[PDB]
């Protein structure tokens, strides 16, 4: 019998806010930038890092950490994700001297391994606490709680902590910040314990209705996926804009203060316009894709108006019209942060009924594999070559990965799971 449960909405709120925690911490260090230099004594490279650090954590911990899904279930995973968060904050307010540094990387990296057992979530616990219509909004939730952390962690960090230059107090000020944080990361960790369920009484649709019963060893259901040559091009397609996200997001500060002398104001702004944007673009796709169910239709249009943001921006970048930059980054953040929650469910249709732990992880190590190429690889030719280089080297990616797209087949397998009925 399938019911669908009250409990839902508390698992995806609990979740969205600790991963909203985690995505926190992950640019905290950004917004700061220029204080926490002068704080712990170390180059822009090392702070960086601090963000860097979560991409090249993802691509090996993934198949353990996806390994652990199936094997302990979902419950293990978040609690493991929201505890290291906690820990993870708790090790930074160990590190308020400037020869403290060290607690700082060993503090994020813990976070860092927190974030393998959120980011690649959301597609498994909308999968197994929804029913067939709300299962596609669900994950765009998720998403859209992981996207208000950068956007809280943009506007946020540079109120509690001014530029000030004494070290005594600016620990103060950084402190609180910490503890703000370890504190919502604790309180999130106790909600973890009481509301989050390993799994509804009843099943919440006929698809994992019918994947529990079919449900064997962990490298074959690895072989299986590699196999599909829809899921592969899948992959490819979804890092190549995820990626080039990841590489737009991080990079647009040095592109936009390049055109726009000073305007480092605006330049944080338009950065938090991308965010703001994909909020809503991320909520729209899992609400259209609930009403429509048109996953490969939509998953081309979406896609291709990345691809006219990417041409729009890259030569309306130059023109000097600040008031441009807010709209081309605002529908192109709508349209890249729209595809997340797409991508992810896409690879659900093609890949049910594998797990969404590995359909939605293997295209979140495509992310970070070409997110961390592009972003070096950009960050290289905008320095030798200027930024216009720089955006159309995105476009041919993207391009690339329009044609690649129009190859990927419909075949929607766990629709066609519902449709028995």
Same mark, same amino acid.
């Given at each position: 019998?399938?019911?669908?449960?009250?409990?839902?909405?508390?698992?995806?709120?609990?979740?969205?806010?600790?991963?909203?925690?985690?995505?926190?911490? #992950?640019?905290?260090?950004?917004?700061?930038?220029?204080?926490?230099?002068?704080?712990?004594?170390?180059?822009?490279?090392?702070?960086? #890092?601090?963000?860097?650090?979560?991409?090249?954590?993802?691509?090996?911990?993934?198949?353990?950490?996806?390994?652990?899904?199936?094997?302990?279930? =979902?419950?293990?995973? /978040? =609690?493991?994700?929201?505890?290291?968060?906690?820990?993870? /904050?708790?090790?930074?307010?160990?590190?308020?001297?400037?020869?403290?540094?060290?607690?700082?990387?060993?503090?994020?990296?813990?976070?860092?391994?927190?974030?393998?057992?959120?980011?690649?979530?959301?597609?498994?616990?909308?999968?197994?606490?929804?029913?067939?219509?709300? *299962?596609?909004?669900?994950?765009?939730?998720? $998403?859209?709680?992981?996207?208000?952390?950068?956007?809280?962690?943009?506007?946020?960090?540079?109120?509690?902590?001014?530029?000030?230059?004494?070290?005594?107090?600016?620990?103060?000020?950084?402190?609180?910040?910490? +503890?703000?944080?370890?504190?919502?990361?604790?309180?999130?960790?106790? =909600? *973890?314990?009481? *509301?989050?369920?390993?799994?509804?009484? +009843?099943?919440?649709?006929?698809?994992?209705?019918?994947?529990?019963?079919?449900?064997?060893?962990?490298?074959?259901?690895?072989?299986?996926?590699?196999?599909?040559?829809?899921?592969?091009?899948?992959?490819?397609?979804?890092?190549?804009? /995820?990626?080039?996200?990841?590489?737009?997001? @991080?990079?647009?500060?040095?592109? $936009?203060? #390049?055109?726009?002398?000073?305007?480092?104001?605006?330049?944080?702004?338009?950065?938090?316009?991308? $965010?703001?944007?994909?909020?809503?673009?991320? *909520?729209?796709?899992?609400?259209?894709?609930?009403?429509?169910?048109?996953?490969?239709?939509? @998953?081309?249009?979406?896609?291709?108006?990345?691809?006219?943001?990417?041409?729009?921006?890259?030569? @309306?970048?130059?023109?000097?019209? =600040?008031?441009?930059?807010?709209?081309?980054?605002?529908?192109?953040?709508?349209?890249? @942060?729209?595809?997340?929650?797409?991508?992810?469910?896409?690879?659900?249709?093609?890949?049910?009924?594998?797990?969404?732990?590995?359909?939605?992880?293997?295209?979140?190590?495509?992310?970070?594999?070409?997110?961390?190429?592009?972003?070096?690889?950009?960050?290289?030719?905008?320095?030798?070559?200027?930024?216009?280089?720089?955006?159309?080297?995105?476009?041919?990616?993207?391009?690339?990965?329009?044609?690649?797209?129009?190859?990927?087949?419909?075949?929607?397998?766990?629709?066609?799971?519902?449709?028995?009925?």
């Amino acid at each position: 019998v399938i019911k669908v449960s009250r409990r839902r909405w508390a698992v995806v709120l609990v979740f969205s806010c600790y991963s909203m925690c985690n995505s926190f911490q #992950w640019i905290q260090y950004g917004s700061i930038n220029n204080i926490f230099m002068h704080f712990y004594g170390v180059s822009a490279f090392a702070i960086d #890092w601090l963000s860097m650090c979560y991409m090249l954590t993802y691509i090996p911990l993934l198949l353990p950490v996806a390994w652990l899904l199936e094997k302990f279930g =979902l419950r293990t995973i /978040a =609690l493991t994700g929201s505890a290291l968060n906690c820990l993870g /904050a708790w090790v930074k307010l160990g590190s308020l001297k400037p020869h403290l540094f060290p607690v700082t990387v060993v503090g994020q990296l813990i976070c860092s391994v927190a974030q393998v057992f959120i980011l690649g979530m959301p597609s498994r616990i909308a999968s197994v606490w929804f029913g067939a219509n709300e *299962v596609s909004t669900a994950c765009s939730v998720a $998403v859209f709680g992981n996207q208000l952390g950068i956007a809280i962690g943009f506007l946020v960090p540079p109120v509690l902590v001014p530029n000030i230059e004494d070290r005594d107090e600016l620990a103060y000020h950084i402190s609180i910040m910490f +503890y703000i944080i370890g504190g919502v990361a604790t309180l999130l960790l106790i =909600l *973890v314990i009481i *509301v989050f369920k390993e799994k509804p009484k +009843y099943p919440p649709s006929r698809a994992q209705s019918l994947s529990y019963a079919l449900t064997a060893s962990y490298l074959g259901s690895i072989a299986r996926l590699f196999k599909n040559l829809n899921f592969v091009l899948l992959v490819i397609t979804y890092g190549l804009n /995820a990626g080039a996200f990841y590489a737009l997001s @991080t990079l647009l500060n040095r592109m $936009v203060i #390049w055109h726009y002398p000073g305007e480092e104001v605006n330049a944080g702004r338009i950065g938090l316009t991308i $965010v703001i944007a994909g909020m809503l673009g991320a *909520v729209i796709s899992g609400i259209w894709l609930d009403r429509s169910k048109t996953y490969k239709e939509t @998953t081309l249009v979406v896609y291709i108006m990345t691809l006219v943001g990417m041409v729009v921006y890259t030569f @309306t970048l130059n023109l000097g019209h =600040l008031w441009v930059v807010f709209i081309t980054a605002g529908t192109m953040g709508f349209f890249m @942060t729209g595809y997340l929650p797409l991508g992810f469910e896409f690879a659900v249709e093609l890949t049910y009924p594998e797990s969404e732990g590995i359909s939605s992880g293997l295209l979140n190590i495509s992310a970070q594999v070409f997110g961390i190429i592009f972003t070096i690889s950009q960050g290289q030719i905008i320095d030798n070559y200027g930024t216009k280089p720089g955006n159309i080297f995105l476009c041919v990616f993207l391009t690339l990965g329009a044609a690649l797209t129009a190859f990927i087949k419909a075949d929607l397998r766990r629709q066609k799971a519902n449709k028995e009925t």
